[PDB]
From Swiss-Prot:
Lysozymes have primarily a bacteriolytic function; those in tissues and body fluids are associated with the monocyte-macrophage system and enhance the activity of immunoagents. It comes from Homo sapiens. This is Lysozyme C. One of its GO terms (biological process) is defense response to Gram-negative bacterium. Monomer.
Length: 130
């Protein structure tokens, strides 16, 4: 599923993401936009280390979900990476919350540092009613 901007905003708010571990909704939106373009089936194989990023938030199979084919992997969130490819993003949200519980926080995603950090991100939730 490819979410519409405001549709996603309201959905993340309902799932309790606004201000989770100090992370504003606008920031989560900026992250999803650049990671997958709000697409739940987005997958990206990292040939260099043999891991794959899954879903709307591009969660890595080496630490957060299990796909069985990732060398030296762990399952921190304890999910099947398959769960992060559903149209229903409840599991992707639970995984994303787990990622930011580590000290790195939102910085865990390099794309956030490149395109969201220290920028004006109000634009991602403008006019959505959240």
């Amino acid at each position: 599923k490819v979410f519409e901007r405001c549709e996603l905003a309201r959905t993340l708010k309902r799932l309790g993401m606004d201000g989770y571990r100090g992370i504003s909704l606008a920031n989560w939106m900026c992250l999803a936009k650049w990671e997958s373009g709000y697409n739940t089936r987005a997958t990206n194989y990292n040939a260099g280390d043999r891991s794959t990023d899954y879903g709307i938030f591009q969660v890595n199979s080496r630490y957060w979900c299990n796909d069985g084919k990732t060398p030296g992997a762990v399952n921190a969130a304890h999910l099947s990476c398959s769960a992060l490819l559903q149209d229903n993003i409840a599991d992707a949200v639970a995984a994303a919350k787990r990622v930011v519980r580590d000290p790195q926080g939102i910085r865990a995603w390099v794309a956030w540092r490149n395109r969201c950090q220290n920028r004006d991100v109000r634009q991602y939730v403008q006019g959505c009613g959240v």
